[PDB]
Point group: D2
């Protein structure tokens, strides 16, 4: 049942947030957002055009060069961010409902993971605003040498639909902590949650134009941001194809880019794994968030001795998941975010069948309406098959036998991706030997899918450029100035 | 200046490439010529790297990275290798400085005192880092050990220009090597000799086969093969904005990390309470150092109105007095531009400066009878929209502009697509730190100019680049951060 | 015109003031109590439960059990951080309560206790709440056969003793960094000024600190403090106070090979060179010594003035001293309050006598003020020489010594000829001279064209006999850590 | 099979051994000398100049002057770095000379002195030369009104005292980090083992160290050591050695509020869990104690074994102990040399008798060995209890104690129930159990599936009464530094 502040919000058309103000599109356009469990329209949203991105950017440039955001102390800036965290926590139920309605994930996991992650995130980055230190370099007695880590200026941020609010924080926490200002575009599929949270930025006391949210379409609002002459730096999370474009375009202006893109991450069950723990790890690794997760362990490698056991366990668990609407208490898995996404994973399933793979579970739509896909388990697969190389992005796992540690490292590594990886082994040497050898940004040894504001996240190879999260994330929003003072 | 025997012997033969630890010719026998810019004579014939040769270099670098000595070796052992190399470079300092003077065109004495010694010092400095490239241990929860590894990114492709040839090879390789990367490096076609002589010294220091591979040639073939190679993990370039754009564009197809060091139009700013003597010299040397073939050159000299006439007069005199000659003549203070193409380009900018209404207070033409020389030039009666105050000329060309307030000069100095460096001259403690804080540049010198050191980072804001070189900072470009979570529950 | 008492301080002051051990409010086991006064009136302000060795003992066992097991030992870093941040919010919410208590118990003016002490305390806890998730160790690349990493573990139960001159702020300097690291605490506030801290105990409870993490044991140096210094089960000791007591502590800690952090006194020079902006430097000079009644360790007790400006700054310093409005801290018009005790008042009046005996001129002040209270007049000493008792030793009152100099190399040597080295100020408009002078002075803190600035993010401490170690900033965390180097064979 | 003396050590030992003060080789002012012995043969190995209080005062003035003015004070970091690297190269050039001096003077085998000691000394200097250019402070973004920065300034003249068991390498531990930061040094080698360091003085001079940057004063602890400890103009003191002398030094240092770092003894535990790889663990347990004849503070002198393997490991250590080949350091066959002195042999023989009369069983050794020299047999003690002298106190010979255990929780407790906390070893093939156990052990360094590993890049130090501070790694630089926070007012 809908919370009253959510009912009130969804009762009017959704406005953009530009220069501390809730506004319509300058030319009045709007777009629809849907509920993927029902396929009905959930809201009508003001649609940002190029001229709106230009208003957002002017407002951001201005808040950065002059005024309170530019005059504030690092303690004062930190307080703003902490207060935002508190506010998001006060409205945890309202935001969780919006993610459940707009994205489609279960309400309770939006509350326990997404909203708590977002809150911890801001809290973490609020602590960095006073600790972004530069250096004093001893070189000569004739010179004082030091570096300042100055905020790069106005940043352009584009994020996807699969963890809408979490990803807004991954982006803004680090950038805001260095003292930048922000033009952010949420995904056309999932703008609501960020646009509700705007109120909380206003109420926490963020000066006008420090943040600006411009919902819309990728080729218009999105591309306006990437091609704008007065955006200093761009950060993107999304598909590899859009990734490549953003970097291409960013080259025209010698603009720093940080990309978080796709994965085909291996999750590896060696002979001395604790089998009961690795099975649950493998299953949650792919099935968490309906498989709509960059870091999903969509290639479960199993030592040959345990293959038939883990496959039997993964089939049983696949058929056991409770499919339903995110706003139903009993739901464990919701649907895909859109019709186009469901069609896409269903075409990947058909491709796998026609290439010779065997569906041991799932492999088809689920329910009467909504964009559901049954959790799917593929067997009899080879490394050269399409389904084993390309990111599917649905609850679809491929399960591969291997006979030696050296073999599985090489097959795990033979990929264009390198975002994450899992390794299950009880042995101390093997754990760290394998972790060392895998070409992946994040390695989990006897676990999978763990994220924290304090730990860096990002890809090797075509999974990205740069890291978000941790201390490392600050570097992207900074510009290093080496000052030399003649004291001779 | 008498040519060293070892230089004589080196120039007496065809100049080989260095791939997988051996001195080689190009697979298909192609060659090109390098000139002495002071005489226009052929200086040496060099083996020209083709696509095929870059391929041989990348395989060798891949092999040295995945297996073998380089891959197994301790950090202390790698540090010792890099240090032995610096010692060798220092032992051959005179040979290297002559090649830098012959090939590039600068005065011997400055190549010795500045270039060679800074090459030695930068390797010396980065050998100390190998053992100190640390990651983190992060406290999150009692249920996990969290730690990060800073793994070397792998095979790295590096392209450099011609204005500081050896020093720039050390800016690229010092940090790369210190992290444990392996390297395919392309020197500039105008100035391959220093680096290919230096190759003898990597071999003698004990570098394993393939750690370092030097492929001289041309940008559209050797350069482009580097940029576009699927097996190179990361690319680093310095040179023209136009080539840098291209490289970042091509790097998008492999989602490949890029470091770019590009041009500048750096302001050198003289406020009312400058020590004027020291600021006039700093202004003159800021633009004229290395014939103005310096991306950080103080090419816009802003002067508070009270001092404007005084510094214009002084820069005209100083400009008129610089002694042009060959780098190998002991009397020479400034040599020539590196090529006929570059002389033509800077002379074109002089004419465009005249067409637009500016006045040439000094110089403004070619000099001498042989050589790509251009006279030191002072432009006056200038405005902010003129192409000469906006674009990188890369010559001994300076633009002198008056101003009347501190806020005004900050706004004008910052209105550039560039942002590499800046100079500020003031005896006031508040104003010095204030002005420096507000200038959008990678490096700011308060009461000095053109100071670089292995330990202080260097790079541009805006279109002057992406990333920093030198210092601790440069390490990060050759690194790949791995976050490891160990469940200890 | 009196600042009216908050209902909550009134209630607090009506009962015996209890100690805080193992999350509970308790009297001393033997039932002893001591009195604390209002130094403006001399009246008894509260009666307080007095901690003996046996009470310190109970606090340590409580600290030990909270460190070895339980919620504080199992909590995530984000959970700890949230606690520390909620604490800062509670302190800000009771800002007026806390500030009335400093003004009453310590003596300083209510308004500055509010604007400065209280907000600095709040700011300090918010800064350290941020470090909790960020105390990072290293991953050292040595050899492909090992995995080498360090952990920065909390050292354990820490013994913390603080003085009376900034009572709440100093409690935050000690506890912020230590709690941030995951340590647990037994902390003795000064017998002159226990109230502020024992009120704040409410707020550690209301924020939800587990029992035993934090324990406050008020009482006397030779009993409660000494029992902290000598307890076998306290892992590390941190002290701020007199140089005499600091040596006793360091000497006693020798017997248990215990890490020690000391913040002691100072004779900090404030240096006005020829090209100072004089109007500013005169205020820096006056404010550098007179802030908090000179009961401030970083105080610019020596004002060095280039000779061109000596007569000018003396005249301004005299006019200013004679103009400060002395009175009760709870009274609105008050600029300067009294000294914390009769004992301290005697100490400073006594240094004033030694100043006159040694030949110096009292240019202003030089005696007690008002009819009651521990007040001393802002004092200006003129005709001074570097060998005099008053120029060498820390007085701790509103007493300043003015010294001319003729050159920069001279003033650097004269400033530096001291056993102390807590802080220094340099006033000069020249870019080179500022940094040159700052580089050459032997002091933990140098302010260039300013004085008495403190912030959570910037470390503070002394060179030579002004201390060992640093407080504030990131540096402070190292005092409460224990480094462990783990090697994992992966051959 | 005798290892043949190097011409250069022949020439060195053929003369009276001189002190190194202010760049020159000198005698003691009063002309006193002392002898050092060959602990294999008990003959006089050399006659060395004895530093007295008056010689420490000369050494301190020279270091003070070298710190305040002259090349060392004006030099760039790149230049300081180059002196330290040239030293490292010269040491490596003289590797055989120096390893023979350790073998003659300390008693350890030549080949191990060369492979370990000399090679680590070199690598230590090489690593610390890399730090001179990278000792960075902070710029702290606090407010737009200030530039806040900190400087890590060298602390000044430092006094360093080292023991006799790893003579040259321990001198590098002290000096690398101290010189890296820009300090100057008065260093006293142990009376038992002065030779390797005073030979190494040739190399400081040949490398181009300015006069006074480094001063070496051989002598007796209660005269030359105490003169360093009690000197008013030494800014900081570092020491490794006995708990007893360390408490003295800290006690004495209190008077000057002088920073102390201490590396003291240990009773380090080496824990074989049920799932250890037993082959490896057995060698680890054996090498862990017997390396350097047990004259190693981090020695695994308490070998804990799961009861499943107790008999298997006791039988193996007994066989290995009875097989060690004892002899002179300069004989080729030697696997273990003698103890350092007659006094050291008598102390360890006393502990063995104490073990016997408390009721423990000597399963091997337990007595002196050979005809001449200060040798003691490798000893295995069994049937031992936690409360026994031999399982509590540091013996410092080739003496191990084997203790069974039944649960992991139990072994963590018994291993931590000690006043010591220098190092520990944990042997388990399980990923989880390795790290959990390493986390719960109260020791400065923990080895997982190995033992006795040290490296210039990884910090070393003790928890509890094993020490204060760390040496090695970046961590060692903080001990020789003094942090200065500058605040520049920019309006
Ligand atoms: N790395 C991730 O976390 C992530 C997230 C979502 C999707 N993906 C991958 O992307 C695939 C397809 O998803 P999609 O097409 O909806 O995502 P997408 O790559 O189009 O990116 C989504 C975001 O980028 C914006 N965008 C689209 N075109 C743009 C343009 N030309 N300029 C600027 N911004 C633009 C979108 O509006 C949205 O904000 C999935 O199958 C999956 O493999 C990855
Ligand atoms: N920490 C270590 O690595 C280490 C090294 C050697 C000995 N020890 C312990 O100490 C025991 C043996 O004692 P020791 O003979 O080494 O004596 P010691 O610890 O006193 O000697 C070590 C150093 O300190 C000096 N010294 C001694 N008394 C001094 C004083 N009063 N002032 C200044 N310096 C002084 C000595 O000359 C020597 O250089 C061993 O059995 C062992 O347990 C520990
Ligand atoms: Na009181």
């Amino acid at each position: 049942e809908l919370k009253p502040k959510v009912e009130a919000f969804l009762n009017e058309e959704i406005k953009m947030f530009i220069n501390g103000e809730f506004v319509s599109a300058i030319g009045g356009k709007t777009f629809e957002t849907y509920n993927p469990a029902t396929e009905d329209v959930l809201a009508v949203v003001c649609e940002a055009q190029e001229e709106d991105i230009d208003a957002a950017v002017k407002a951001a440039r201005s808040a950065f060069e002059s005024g309170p955001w530019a005059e504030m102390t690092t303690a004062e800036r930190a307080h703003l961010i902490y207060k935002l965290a508190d506010l998001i926590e006060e409205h945890r139920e309202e935001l969780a409902q919006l993610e459940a309605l707009d994205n489609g994930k279960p309400y309770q996991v939006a509350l326990d993971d997404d909203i708590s992650a977002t809150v911890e995130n801001y809290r973490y980055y609020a602590g960095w605003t006073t600790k972004i230190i530069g250096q004093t370099i001893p070189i000569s007695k004739d010179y004082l040498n030091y570096t300042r880590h100055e905020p790069v200026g106005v940043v352009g941020q584009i994020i996807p639909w699969n963890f809408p609010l979490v990803m807004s924080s991954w982006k803004m926490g680090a950038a805001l902590a260095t003292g930048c200002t922000i033009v952010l575009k949420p995904a056309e599929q999932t703008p609501l949650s960020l646009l509700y949270a705007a109120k909380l930025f206003k109420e926490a006391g963020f000066p006008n134009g420090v943040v600006n949210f411009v919902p819309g379409f990728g080729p218009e609002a999105g591309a306006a941001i990437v091609n704008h002459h007065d955006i200093d730096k761009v950060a993107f999370t999304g598909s590899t194809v859009t990734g490549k474009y953003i970097m291409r375009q960013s080259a025209e202006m010698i603009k720093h880019v940080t990309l978080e893109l796709g994965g085909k991450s291996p999750n590896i069950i060696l002979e001395d794994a604790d089998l009961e723990e690795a099975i649950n790890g493998a299953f949650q690794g792919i099935m968490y968030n309906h498989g709509q997760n960059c870091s999903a362990g969509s290639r479960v490698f199993v030592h040959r001795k345990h293959y038939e056991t883990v496959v039997d366990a993964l089939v049983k668990m696949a058929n056991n998941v409770k499919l339903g609407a995110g706003m139903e208490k009993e739901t464990e898995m919701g649907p895909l975010v859109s019709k186009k996404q469901q069609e896409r994973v269903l075409n990947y399933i058909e491709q796998g069948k026609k290439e010779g793979a065997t569906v041991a579970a799932g492999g088809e739509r689920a329910l009467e309406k909504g964009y559901f896909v049954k959790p799917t388990v593929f067997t009899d697969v080879t490394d050269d098959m399409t389904i084993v190389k390309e990111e599917i992005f649905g609850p679809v796992v491929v399960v591969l036998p291997f006979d030696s540690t050296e073999e599985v490292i090489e097959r795990a590594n033979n990929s264009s991706y390198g975002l994450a990886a899992g390794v299950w082994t009880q042995n101390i040497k093997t754990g760290h030997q394998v972790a060392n050898k895998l070409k992946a940004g994040t390695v989990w040894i006897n676990d999978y899918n763990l994220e924290n504001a304090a730990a860096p996240f990002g890809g090797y190879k075509q999974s990205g450029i740069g890291r978000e999260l941790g201390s490392y994330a600050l570097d992207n929003y900074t510009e290093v100035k080496s000052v030399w003072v003649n004291i001779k």
